[PDB]
């Protein structure tokens, strides 16, 4: 048998944390130490998360009504002796343990989407007096560097950097900022324009060559396209070697195509060929890309087989039956690949997307009500 | 005489999960 | 604020050296409240060699409150002089990490990893 001992006072510093298989693998990895880290914005209010170098878990405390004792083996200074009575089902004691902790709760860990804390970071639209406007704000405290941002965000380093690149994060005059859609697209256009004019390798762009190409023949005082702006644009529309960037050309073409949809066929339809003409005409001269209407799936619909018109998902109903109804009213017959991105967000319970469509629609391969 | 025993709980209850702050870990 | 989890000590002990972990720890669970005296110091003076209910370990007065007997998955717990509880050794679906939160330096150290627990969810019985 095992002798059970208890201290008169437990240490509440000992706590139970749920270890997911991945968390367990990380913790049980002798190769590296300090791979997991508790992070919080503040001590008294904000949530605490557990982060590796590329993943984030949210902590949740859960109280229970049972007695849970954390006990450890100890070597008695003196032999533990007591008179044995009529104890049956009890063998001779061979071991002593002492309850050193008494927990009333567990700390559960749930995998969660790491996110950036974008509280104090302003939006940059390419103004020339941006430094002044920020300096004349109510909140003087400004996030200086990206390291500070990641440090004070509920996310891992890799998640943070990825999101920062995805949202067009940048820095102007020493203050971190987020480029507006307008300025992002303008900076992209200027970058592409300059890239063609200097015959830069679109598969191997760097910050210095691109920035120099952009600000070569313009005054510094009137040039908002700094090295950081260029680097941001590259980190948004290109992919860097794990050294140099290569443009995501179909993605760029898609962006221009969405803009084109919003500009030319908003509220009105138009032959696909002519729209292709306008779309292509939006690009900087000699820019290498082959456009196709399929790039714009989820951003358009076809009133007729030879016409195209813009549609925003935000204007669609949130109830499945109604959304399918209005989509089918706008267009009687759909191609299978065209309606999916318009209705995917409504699949909350999770199933096969084809079956999901089957519930409200039928094939005949095109799609009908 | 020393008195040691277990007061049996008829069942088991789990409270609602709660958020965790920095002070919750380091009390 | 932010701080890394230190698992170096646990790692070293794990590489070196029943349900008891190699580090010599276990988790006991009882569906109820373990009623212990509020004053160990007073009762330790009345403790007779026959009873052996109290002892001193590393400057702490420990009470011997029961006995545990493990038979495979089955487990039996004797509490006090008059209680017997039947329970089981169950493998945790989600392994539990025991961590020590050092408030002084705001440092966290991995103590151990619990994969099993000895649980007693049924009403206590007479000693025989």
PDB file of N, CA and C in Angstrom, chain A residues 1-2 4-8 13-19 24 27-28 30 33-34 36-40 42-43 50 66-74 76-77 81-83 86 88-91 95 98 106 151, chain C residues 1-8 10-11 24-34 36 40 49-52 56-58 60-69 77-78 95-101 110 115 128:
ATOM      1  N   UNK A   1       0.823  -1.206   0.000  1.00  0.00           N
ATOM      2  CA  UNK A   1       0.000   0.000   0.000  1.00  0.00           C
ATOM      3  C   UNK A   1       0.858   1.257   0.000  1.00  0.00           C
ATOM      4  N   UNK A   2       0.221   2.394  -0.249  1.00  0.00           N
ATOM      5  CA  UNK A   2       0.910   3.675  -0.220  1.00  0.00           C
ATOM      6  C   UNK A   2       0.362   4.559   0.894  1.00  0.00           C
ATOM      7  N   UNK A   4      -0.580   7.899   2.529  1.00  0.00           N
ATOM      8  CA  UNK A   4      -0.944   9.221   2.042  1.00  0.00           C
ATOM      9  C   UNK A   4      -0.793  10.268   3.136  1.00  0.00           C
ATOM     10  N   UNK A   5       0.058  11.256   2.886  1.00  0.00           N
ATOM     11  CA  UNK A   5       0.274  12.335   3.838  1.00  0.00           C
ATOM     12  C   UNK A   5      -0.197  13.670   3.276  1.00  0.00           C
ATOM     13  N   UNK A   6      -0.502  14.604   4.169  1.00  0.00           N
ATOM     14  CA  UNK A   6      -0.948  15.927   3.758  1.00  0.00           C
ATOM     15  C   UNK A   6      -0.299  17.023   4.592  1.00  0.00           C
ATOM     16  N   UNK A   7       0.114  18.091   3.919  1.00  0.00           N
ATOM     17  CA  UNK A   7       0.650  19.266   4.590  1.00  0.00           C
ATOM     18  C   UNK A   7      -0.500  20.114   5.115  1.00  0.00           C
ATOM     19  N   UNK A   8      -0.254  20.903   6.174  1.00  0.00           N
ATOM     20  CA  UNK A   8      -1.315  21.770   6.697  1.00  0.00           C
ATOM     21  C   UNK A   8      -1.587  22.946   5.770  1.00  0.00           C
ATOM     22  N   UNK A  13       0.987  28.126  -5.964  1.00  0.00           N
ATOM     23  CA  UNK A  13       1.795  28.400  -7.149  1.00  0.00           C
ATOM     24  C   UNK A  13       1.733  27.254  -8.154  1.00  0.00           C
ATOM     25  N   UNK A  14       1.486  26.044  -7.656  1.00  0.00           N
ATOM     26  CA  UNK A  14       1.358  24.870  -8.515  1.00  0.00           C
ATOM     27  C   UNK A  14      -0.005  24.852  -9.193  1.00  0.00           C
ATOM     28  N   UNK A  15      -0.003  24.833 -10.522  1.00  0.00           N
ATOM     29  CA  UNK A  15      -1.247  24.863 -11.278  1.00  0.00           C
ATOM     30  C   UNK A  15      -1.255  23.826 -12.392  1.00  0.00           C
ATOM     31  N   UNK A  16      -2.449  23.359 -12.743  1.00  0.00           N
ATOM     32  CA  UNK A  16      -2.606  22.354 -13.785  1.00  0.00           C
ATOM     33  C   UNK A  16      -2.933  22.993 -15.130  1.00  0.00           C
ATOM     34  N   UNK A  17      -2.135  22.673 -16.142  1.00  0.00           N
ATOM     35  CA  UNK A  17      -2.349  23.200 -17.482  1.00  0.00           C
ATOM     36  C   UNK A  17      -2.600  22.063 -18.466  1.00  0.00           C
ATOM     37  N   UNK A  18      -3.683  22.161 -19.233  1.00  0.00           N
ATOM     38  CA  UNK A  18      -3.966  21.160 -20.255  1.00  0.00           C
ATOM     39  C   UNK A  18      -2.896  21.182 -21.334  1.00  0.00           C
ATOM     40  N   UNK A  19      -2.378  20.007 -21.667  1.00  0.00           N
ATOM     41  CA  UNK A  19      -1.353  19.895 -22.691  1.00  0.00           C
ATOM     42  C   UNK A  19      -1.873  19.153 -23.911  1.00  0.00           C
ATOM     43  N   UNK A  24       2.400  19.165 -25.859  1.00  0.00           N
ATOM     44  CA  UNK A  24       3.158  18.121 -25.184  1.00  0.00           C
ATOM     45  C   UNK A  24       4.447  17.817 -25.942  1.00  0.00           C
ATOM     46  N   UNK A  27       6.848  20.777 -25.342  1.00  0.00           N
ATOM     47  CA  UNK A  27       7.369  20.726 -23.981  1.00  0.00           C
ATOM     48  C   UNK A  27       8.351  19.568 -23.809  1.00  0.00           C
ATOM     49  N   UNK A  28       8.012  18.416 -24.382  1.00  0.00           N
ATOM     50  CA  UNK A  28       8.860  17.233 -24.285  1.00  0.00           C
ATOM     51  C   UNK A  28       9.897  17.186 -25.405  1.00  0.00           C
ATOM     52  N   UNK A  30      13.745  18.018 -25.881  1.00  0.00           N
ATOM     53  CA  UNK A  30      15.035  18.347 -25.260  1.00  0.00           C
ATOM     54  C   UNK A  30      15.931  19.190 -26.162  1.00  0.00           C
ATOM     55  N   UNK A  33      14.897  24.692 -25.315  1.00  0.00           N
ATOM     56  CA  UNK A  33      14.159  25.110 -24.130  1.00  0.00           C
ATOM     57  C   UNK A  33      13.512  26.471 -24.368  1.00  0.00           C
ATOM     58  N   UNK A  34      12.554  26.828 -23.515  1.00  0.00           N
ATOM     59  CA  UNK A  34      11.860  28.113 -23.594  1.00  0.00           C
ATOM     60  C   UNK A  34      11.170  28.317 -24.942  1.00  0.00           C
ATOM     61  N   UNK A  36       7.939  27.731 -25.394  1.00  0.00           N
ATOM     62  CA  UNK A  36       6.597  28.224 -25.107  1.00  0.00           C
ATOM     63  C   UNK A  36       6.667  29.450 -24.212  1.00  0.00           C
ATOM     64  N   UNK A  37       5.719  30.361 -24.389  1.00  0.00           N
ATOM     65  CA  UNK A  37       5.769  31.638 -23.693  1.00  0.00           C
ATOM     66  C   UNK A  37       4.379  32.156 -23.346  1.00  0.00           C
ATOM     67  N   UNK A  38       4.189  32.587 -22.103  1.00  0.00           N
ATOM     68  CA  UNK A  38       2.945  33.251 -21.724  1.00  0.00           C
ATOM     69  C   UNK A  38       3.030  34.736 -22.066  1.00  0.00           C
ATOM     70  N   UNK A  39       2.007  35.249 -22.744  1.00  0.00           N
ATOM     71  CA  UNK A  39       1.989  36.646 -23.167  1.00  0.00           C
ATOM     72  C   UNK A  39       0.684  37.335 -22.791  1.00  0.00           C
ATOM     73  N   UNK A  40       0.781  38.607 -22.419  1.00  0.00           N
ATOM     74  CA  UNK A  40      -0.392  39.407 -22.098  1.00  0.00           C
ATOM     75  C   UNK A  40      -0.099  40.887 -22.309  1.00  0.00           C
ATOM     76  N   UNK A  42      -1.433  43.363 -20.530  1.00  0.00           N
ATOM     77  CA  UNK A  42      -1.296  43.931 -19.195  1.00  0.00           C
ATOM     78  C   UNK A  42      -1.476  42.842 -18.144  1.00  0.00           C
ATOM     79  N   UNK A  43      -1.396  43.216 -16.872  1.00  0.00           N
ATOM     80  CA  UNK A  43      -1.439  42.227 -15.798  1.00  0.00           C
ATOM     81  C   UNK A  43      -2.830  41.988 -15.205  1.00  0.00           C
ATOM     82  N   UNK A  50      -0.758  31.457 -24.711  1.00  0.00           N
ATOM     83  CA  UNK A  50       0.462  30.666 -24.761  1.00  0.00           C
ATOM     84  C   UNK A  50       0.941  30.581 -26.203  1.00  0.00           C
ATOM     85  N   UNK A  66     -14.597  18.831  -7.224  1.00  0.00           N
ATOM     86  CA  UNK A  66     -13.911  17.698  -6.611  1.00  0.00           C
ATOM     87  C   UNK A  66     -12.662  18.087  -5.831  1.00  0.00           C
ATOM     88  N   UNK A  67     -12.175  17.149  -5.024  1.00  0.00           N
ATOM     89  CA  UNK A  67     -10.902  17.309  -4.338  1.00  0.00           C
ATOM     90  C   UNK A  67      -9.780  16.729  -5.189  1.00  0.00           C
ATOM     91  N   UNK A  68      -8.902  17.594  -5.682  1.00  0.00           N
ATOM     92  CA  UNK A  68      -7.760  17.138  -6.462  1.00  0.00           C
ATOM     93  C   UNK A  68      -6.454  17.452  -5.744  1.00  0.00           C
ATOM     94  N   UNK A  69      -5.736  16.396  -5.379  1.00  0.00           N
ATOM     95  CA  UNK A  69      -4.474  16.527  -4.665  1.00  0.00           C
ATOM     96  C   UNK A  69      -3.289  16.132  -5.534  1.00  0.00           C
ATOM     97  N   UNK A  70      -2.365  17.069  -5.705  1.00  0.00           N
ATOM     98  CA  UNK A  70      -1.093  16.795  -6.345  1.00  0.00           C
ATOM     99  C   UNK A  70      -0.110  16.362  -5.268  1.00  0.00           C
ATOM    100  N   UNK A  71       0.365  15.124  -5.399  1.00  0.00           N
ATOM    101  CA  UNK A  71       1.187  14.481  -4.378  1.00  0.00           C
ATOM    102  C   UNK A  71       2.525  14.000  -4.933  1.00  0.00           C
ATOM    103  N   UNK A  72       3.569  14.103  -4.115  1.00  0.00           N
ATOM    104  CA  UNK A  72       4.898  13.642  -4.496  1.00  0.00           C
ATOM    105  C   UNK A  72       5.465  12.659  -3.476  1.00  0.00           C
ATOM    106  N   UNK A  73       6.304  11.744  -3.946  1.00  0.00           N
ATOM    107  CA  UNK A  73       6.991  10.808  -3.065  1.00  0.00           C
ATOM    108  C   UNK A  73       8.021  11.540  -2.215  1.00  0.00           C
ATOM    109  N   UNK A  74       8.139  11.152  -0.950  1.00  0.00           N
ATOM    110  CA  UNK A  74       9.159  11.725  -0.086  1.00  0.00           C
ATOM    111  C   UNK A  74       9.799  10.648   0.778  1.00  0.00           C
ATOM    112  N   UNK A  76      10.802   9.709   4.338  1.00  0.00           N
ATOM    113  CA  UNK A  76      10.554  10.066   5.737  1.00  0.00           C
ATOM    114  C   UNK A  76      11.847  10.134   6.538  1.00  0.00           C
ATOM    115  N   UNK A  77      12.025  11.209   7.299  1.00  0.00           N
ATOM    116  CA  UNK A  77      13.204  11.363   8.143  1.00  0.00           C
ATOM    117  C   UNK A  77      13.259  10.238   9.173  1.00  0.00           C
ATOM    118  N   UNK A  81       5.678   4.643  11.370  1.00  0.00           N
ATOM    119  CA  UNK A  81       5.174   3.490  12.107  1.00  0.00           C
ATOM    120  C   UNK A  81       3.817   3.768  12.741  1.00  0.00           C
ATOM    121  N   UNK A  82       2.898   2.822  12.576  1.00  0.00           N
ATOM    122  CA  UNK A  82       1.580   2.908  13.187  1.00  0.00           C
ATOM    123  C   UNK A  82       1.011   1.509  13.405  1.00  0.00           C
ATOM    124  N   UNK A  83       0.192   1.370  14.441  1.00  0.00           N
ATOM    125  CA  UNK A  83      -0.429   0.092  14.770  1.00  0.00           C
ATOM    126  C   UNK A  83      -1.399  -0.353  13.687  1.00  0.00           C
ATOM    127  N   UNK A  86      -7.571  -4.184  11.834  1.00  0.00           N
ATOM    128  CA  UNK A  86      -8.246  -5.075  10.898  1.00  0.00           C
ATOM    129  C   UNK A  86      -8.425  -4.429   9.525  1.00  0.00           C
ATOM    130  N   UNK A  88      -8.271  -4.888   5.631  1.00  0.00           N
ATOM    131  CA  UNK A  88      -8.303  -5.940   4.622  1.00  0.00           C
ATOM    132  C   UNK A  88      -8.318  -5.318   3.236  1.00  0.00           C
ATOM    133  N   UNK A  89      -7.564  -5.908   2.315  1.00  0.00           N
ATOM    134  CA  UNK A  89      -7.429  -5.339   0.990  1.00  0.00           C
ATOM    135  C   UNK A  89      -6.301  -4.330   1.041  1.00  0.00           C
ATOM    136  N   UNK A  90      -5.532  -4.398   2.124  1.00  0.00           N
ATOM    137  CA  UNK A  90      -4.436  -3.470   2.362  1.00  0.00           C
ATOM    138  C   UNK A  90      -3.140  -4.223   2.635  1.00  0.00           C
ATOM    139  N   UNK A  91      -2.189  -4.076   1.721  1.00  0.00           N
ATOM    140  CA  UNK A  91      -0.868  -4.671   1.869  1.00  0.00           C
ATOM    141  C   UNK A  91       0.043  -3.740   2.660  1.00  0.00           C
ATOM    142  N   UNK A  95       5.676   2.853   0.512  1.00  0.00           N
ATOM    143  CA  UNK A  95       5.916   4.157  -0.087  1.00  0.00           C
ATOM    144  C   UNK A  95       5.097   5.252   0.592  1.00  0.00           C
ATOM    145  N   UNK A  98       3.238  12.801  -0.222  1.00  0.00           N
ATOM    146  CA  UNK A  98       2.626  13.940   0.450  1.00  0.00           C
ATOM    147  C   UNK A  98       1.933  14.856  -0.551  1.00  0.00           C
ATOM    148  N   UNK A 106      -8.747  23.704 -13.468  1.00  0.00           N
ATOM    149  CA  UNK A 106      -7.752  23.381 -14.480  1.00  0.00           C
ATOM    150  C   UNK A 106      -7.607  24.541 -15.450  1.00  0.00           C
ATOM    151  N   UNK A 151       5.232  42.163 -29.599  1.00  0.00           N
ATOM    152  CA  UNK A 151       5.410  41.916 -28.174  1.00  0.00           C
ATOM    153  C   UNK A 151       4.122  42.176 -27.398  1.00  0.00           C
TER     154      UNK A 151
ATOM    155  N   UNK C   1       3.055  42.032 -20.208  1.00  0.00           N
ATOM    156  CA  UNK C   1       4.223  41.262 -19.767  1.00  0.00           C
ATOM    157  C   UNK C   1       4.349  39.934 -20.502  1.00  0.00           C
ATOM    158  N   UNK C   2       5.495  39.280 -20.355  1.00  0.00           N
ATOM    159  CA  UNK C   2       5.742  38.020 -21.040  1.00  0.00           C
ATOM    160  C   UNK C   2       6.885  37.243 -20.390  1.00  0.00           C
ATOM    161  N   UNK C   3       6.798  35.915 -20.429  1.00  0.00           N
ATOM    162  CA  UNK C   3       7.829  35.065 -19.837  1.00  0.00           C
ATOM    163  C   UNK C   3       7.806  33.652 -20.431  1.00  0.00           C
ATOM    164  N   UNK C   4       8.991  33.095 -20.663  1.00  0.00           N
ATOM    165  CA  UNK C   4       9.113  31.746 -21.202  1.00  0.00           C
ATOM    166  C   UNK C   4       8.819  30.687 -20.147  1.00  0.00           C
ATOM    167  N   UNK C   5       8.355  29.526 -20.599  1.00  0.00           N
ATOM    168  CA  UNK C   5       8.192  28.374 -19.723  1.00  0.00           C
ATOM    169  C   UNK C   5       9.502  27.601 -19.643  1.00  0.00           C
ATOM    170  N   UNK C   6      10.028  27.446 -18.433  1.00  0.00           N
ATOM    171  CA  UNK C   6      11.266  26.703 -18.238  1.00  0.00           C
ATOM    172  C   UNK C   6      10.974  25.225 -17.998  1.00  0.00           C
ATOM    173  N   UNK C   7      11.479  24.373 -18.885  1.00  0.00           N
ATOM    174  CA  UNK C   7      11.279  22.935 -18.763  1.00  0.00           C
ATOM    175  C   UNK C   7      12.615  22.208 -18.721  1.00  0.00           C
ATOM    176  N   UNK C   8      13.677  22.950 -18.425  1.00  0.00           N
ATOM    177  CA  UNK C   8      15.021  22.383 -18.381  1.00  0.00           C
ATOM    178  C   UNK C   8      15.179  21.384 -17.239  1.00  0.00           C
ATOM    179  N   UNK C  10      12.852  19.733 -15.536  1.00  0.00           N
ATOM    180  CA  UNK C  10      12.015  18.573 -15.810  1.00  0.00           C
ATOM    181  C   UNK C  10      12.654  17.682 -16.862  1.00  0.00           C
ATOM    182  N   UNK C  11      13.302  18.304 -17.839  1.00  0.00           N
ATOM    183  CA  UNK C  11      13.938  17.569 -18.921  1.00  0.00           C
ATOM    184  C   UNK C  11      15.108  16.751 -18.384  1.00  0.00           C
ATOM    185  N   UNK C  24       8.362  10.970  -9.516  1.00  0.00           N
ATOM    186  CA  UNK C  24       7.793  10.580  -8.239  1.00  0.00           C
ATOM    187  C   UNK C  24       6.543  11.336  -7.832  1.00  0.00           C
ATOM    188  N   UNK C  25       5.650  11.586  -8.784  1.00  0.00           N
ATOM    189  CA  UNK C  25       4.438  12.342  -8.491  1.00  0.00           C
ATOM    190  C   UNK C  25       3.175  11.669  -9.019  1.00  0.00           C
ATOM    191  N   UNK C  26       2.042  11.999  -8.406  1.00  0.00           N
ATOM    192  CA  UNK C  26       0.764  11.416  -8.793  1.00  0.00           C
ATOM    193  C   UNK C  26      -0.398  12.360  -8.505  1.00  0.00           C
ATOM    194  N   UNK C  27      -1.543  12.067  -9.114  1.00  0.00           N
ATOM    195  CA  UNK C  27      -2.735  12.891  -8.971  1.00  0.00           C
ATOM    196  C   UNK C  27      -3.883  12.094  -8.364  1.00  0.00           C
ATOM    197  N   UNK C  28      -4.386  12.566  -7.229  1.00  0.00           N
ATOM    198  CA  UNK C  28      -5.505  11.919  -6.555  1.00  0.00           C
ATOM    199  C   UNK C  28      -6.774  12.753  -6.686  1.00  0.00           C
ATOM    200  N   UNK C  29      -7.879  12.109  -7.046  1.00  0.00           N
ATOM    201  CA  UNK C  29      -9.146  12.816  -7.179  1.00  0.00           C
ATOM    202  C   UNK C  29     -10.263  12.125  -6.408  1.00  0.00           C
ATOM    203  N   UNK C  30     -10.977  12.906  -5.605  1.00  0.00           N
ATOM    204  CA  UNK C  30     -12.072  12.390  -4.797  1.00  0.00           C
ATOM    205  C   UNK C  30     -13.334  13.220  -5.008  1.00  0.00           C
ATOM    206  N   UNK C  31     -14.444  12.555  -5.313  1.00  0.00           N
ATOM    207  CA  UNK C  31     -15.726  13.241  -5.431  1.00  0.00           C
ATOM    208  C   UNK C  31     -16.262  13.559  -4.040  1.00  0.00           C
ATOM    209  N   UNK C  32     -15.714  14.604  -3.435  1.00  0.00           N
ATOM    210  CA  UNK C  32     -16.091  14.993  -2.091  1.00  0.00           C
ATOM    211  C   UNK C  32     -15.056  15.901  -1.462  1.00  0.00           C
ATOM    212  N   UNK C  33     -15.222  16.175  -0.174  1.00  0.00           N
ATOM    213  CA  UNK C  33     -14.298  17.040   0.545  1.00  0.00           C
ATOM    214  C   UNK C  33     -13.488  16.241   1.559  1.00  0.00           C
ATOM    215  N   UNK C  34     -12.167  16.348   1.473  1.00  0.00           N
ATOM    216  CA  UNK C  34     -11.291  15.662   2.411  1.00  0.00           C
ATOM    217  C   UNK C  34     -11.200  16.457   3.707  1.00  0.00           C
ATOM    218  N   UNK C  36      -9.870  17.383   7.004  1.00  0.00           N
ATOM    219  CA  UNK C  36      -8.712  17.288   7.881  1.00  0.00           C
ATOM    220  C   UNK C  36      -8.856  18.301   9.012  1.00  0.00           C
ATOM    221  N   UNK C  40      -3.129  21.134  13.003  1.00  0.00           N
ATOM    222  CA  UNK C  40      -2.206  20.003  13.022  1.00  0.00           C
ATOM    223  C   UNK C  40      -1.298  20.055  14.246  1.00  0.00           C
ATOM    224  N   UNK C  49       2.605   6.871  19.354  1.00  0.00           N
ATOM    225  CA  UNK C  49       3.316   5.990  18.419  1.00  0.00           C
ATOM    226  C   UNK C  49       2.378   4.982  17.761  1.00  0.00           C
ATOM    227  N   UNK C  50       1.361   4.553  18.505  1.00  0.00           N
ATOM    228  CA  UNK C  50       0.372   3.610  18.001  1.00  0.00           C
ATOM    229  C   UNK C  50      -0.404   4.169  16.813  1.00  0.00           C
ATOM    230  N   UNK C  51      -0.748   5.451  16.893  1.00  0.00           N
ATOM    231  CA  UNK C  51      -1.527   6.109  15.850  1.00  0.00           C
ATOM    232  C   UNK C  51      -0.680   6.456  14.629  1.00  0.00           C
ATOM    233  N   UNK C  52       0.481   7.058  14.876  1.00  0.00           N
ATOM    234  CA  UNK C  52       1.382   7.482  13.818  1.00  0.00           C
ATOM    235  C   UNK C  52       0.725   8.376  12.784  1.00  0.00           C
ATOM    236  N   UNK C  56       7.138  14.869  11.261  1.00  0.00           N
ATOM    237  CA  UNK C  56       7.793  16.069  10.760  1.00  0.00           C
ATOM    238  C   UNK C  56       8.681  15.754   9.563  1.00  0.00           C
ATOM    239  N   UNK C  57       8.438  16.456   8.462  1.00  0.00           N
ATOM    240  CA  UNK C  57       9.218  16.289   7.244  1.00  0.00           C
ATOM    241  C   UNK C  57       9.636  17.649   6.695  1.00  0.00           C
ATOM    242  N   UNK C  58      10.946  17.885   6.667  1.00  0.00           N
ATOM    243  CA  UNK C  58      11.525  19.121   6.141  1.00  0.00           C
ATOM    244  C   UNK C  58      10.891  20.367   6.762  1.00  0.00           C
ATOM    245  N   UNK C  60       7.989  20.672   8.052  1.00  0.00           N
ATOM    246  CA  UNK C  60       6.534  20.714   7.933  1.00  0.00           C
ATOM    247  C   UNK C  60       5.885  19.554   8.680  1.00  0.00           C
ATOM    248  N   UNK C  61       4.831  19.847   9.434  1.00  0.00           N
ATOM    249  CA  UNK C  61       4.103  18.805  10.146  1.00  0.00           C
ATOM    250  C   UNK C  61       3.056  18.173   9.238  1.00  0.00           C
ATOM    251  N   UNK C  62       3.333  16.950   8.797  1.00  0.00           N
ATOM    252  CA  UNK C  62       2.439  16.226   7.906  1.00  0.00           C
ATOM    253  C   UNK C  62       1.503  15.304   8.671  1.00  0.00           C
ATOM    254  N   UNK C  63       0.258  15.239   8.206  1.00  0.00           N
ATOM    255  CA  UNK C  63      -0.709  14.291   8.736  1.00  0.00           C
ATOM    256  C   UNK C  63      -0.827  13.087   7.805  1.00  0.00           C
ATOM    257  N   UNK C  64      -0.813  11.895   8.387  1.00  0.00           N
ATOM    258  CA  UNK C  64      -1.054  10.675   7.633  1.00  0.00           C
ATOM    259  C   UNK C  64      -2.552  10.411   7.616  1.00  0.00           C
ATOM    260  N   UNK C  65      -3.205  10.724   6.501  1.00  0.00           N
ATOM    261  CA  UNK C  65      -4.664  10.709   6.475  1.00  0.00           C
ATOM    262  C   UNK C  65      -5.256   9.463   5.827  1.00  0.00           C
ATOM    263  N   UNK C  66      -4.426   8.659   5.171  1.00  0.00           N
ATOM    264  CA  UNK C  66      -4.948   7.460   4.545  1.00  0.00           C
ATOM    265  C   UNK C  66      -3.963   6.510   3.900  1.00  0.00           C
ATOM    266  N   UNK C  67      -4.505   5.506   3.219  1.00  0.00           N
ATOM    267  CA  UNK C  67      -3.693   4.506   2.538  1.00  0.00           C
ATOM    268  C   UNK C  67      -4.248   4.236   1.148  1.00  0.00           C
ATOM    269  N   UNK C  68      -3.360   3.980   0.195  1.00  0.00           N
ATOM    270  CA  UNK C  68      -3.784   3.708  -1.171  1.00  0.00           C
ATOM    271  C   UNK C  68      -3.272   2.357  -1.651  1.00  0.00           C
ATOM    272  N   UNK C  69      -4.167   1.568  -2.233  1.00  0.00           N
ATOM    273  CA  UNK C  69      -3.821   0.243  -2.724  1.00  0.00           C
ATOM    274  C   UNK C  69      -4.211   0.108  -4.189  1.00  0.00           C
ATOM    275  N   UNK C  77      -9.010   3.119  -1.507  1.00  0.00           N
ATOM    276  CA  UNK C  77      -8.524   4.189  -0.652  1.00  0.00           C
ATOM    277  C   UNK C  77      -9.085   4.078   0.755  1.00  0.00           C
ATOM    278  N   UNK C  78      -8.207   3.961   1.739  1.00  0.00           N
ATOM    279  CA  UNK C  78      -8.641   3.993   3.124  1.00  0.00           C
ATOM    280  C   UNK C  78      -8.451   5.399   3.660  1.00  0.00           C
ATOM    281  N   UNK C  95      -3.433  14.983 -21.132  1.00  0.00           N
ATOM    282  CA  UNK C  95      -2.372  15.032 -20.120  1.00  0.00           C
ATOM    283  C   UNK C  95      -2.257  16.413 -19.482  1.00  0.00           C
ATOM    284  N   UNK C  96      -2.020  16.448 -18.176  1.00  0.00           N
ATOM    285  CA  UNK C  96      -1.971  17.705 -17.443  1.00  0.00           C
ATOM    286  C   UNK C  96      -0.543  18.084 -17.078  1.00  0.00           C
ATOM    287  N   UNK C  97      -0.163  19.312 -17.411  1.00  0.00           N
ATOM    288  CA  UNK C  97       1.138  19.825 -17.032  1.00  0.00           C
ATOM    289  C   UNK C  97       1.074  20.524 -15.689  1.00  0.00           C
ATOM    290  N   UNK C  98       1.919  20.095 -14.760  1.00  0.00           N
ATOM    291  CA  UNK C  98       2.047  20.783 -13.484  1.00  0.00           C
ATOM    292  C   UNK C  98       3.133  21.839 -13.586  1.00  0.00           C
ATOM    293  N   UNK C  99       2.760  23.091 -13.354  1.00  0.00           N
ATOM    294  CA  UNK C  99       3.706  24.190 -13.476  1.00  0.00           C
ATOM    295  C   UNK C  99       3.759  25.020 -12.204  1.00  0.00           C
ATOM    296  N   UNK C 100       4.954  25.491 -11.868  1.00  0.00           N
ATOM    297  CA  UNK C 100       5.140  26.334 -10.698  1.00  0.00           C
ATOM    298  C   UNK C 100       5.309  27.788 -11.109  1.00  0.00           C
ATOM    299  N   UNK C 101       4.377  28.627 -10.676  1.00  0.00           N
ATOM    300  CA  UNK C 101       4.417  30.041 -11.015  1.00  0.00           C
ATOM    301  C   UNK C 101       5.094  30.851  -9.917  1.00  0.00           C
ATOM    302  N   UNK C 110       8.233  24.096 -15.444  1.00  0.00           N
ATOM    303  CA  UNK C 110       7.514  22.840 -15.578  1.00  0.00           C
ATOM    304  C   UNK C 110       7.910  21.886 -14.458  1.00  0.00           C
ATOM    305  N   UNK C 115      -0.201  11.939 -16.722  1.00  0.00           N
ATOM    306  CA  UNK C 115      -0.891  11.187 -17.766  1.00  0.00           C
ATOM    307  C   UNK C 115      -1.977  10.285 -17.188  1.00  0.00           C
ATOM    308  N   UNK C 128     -15.030  -2.702   6.330  1.00  0.00           N
ATOM    309  CA  UNK C 128     -15.234  -4.094   5.941  1.00  0.00           C
ATOM    310  C   UNK C 128     -16.720  -4.417   5.825  1.00  0.00           C
TER     311      UNK C 128
END
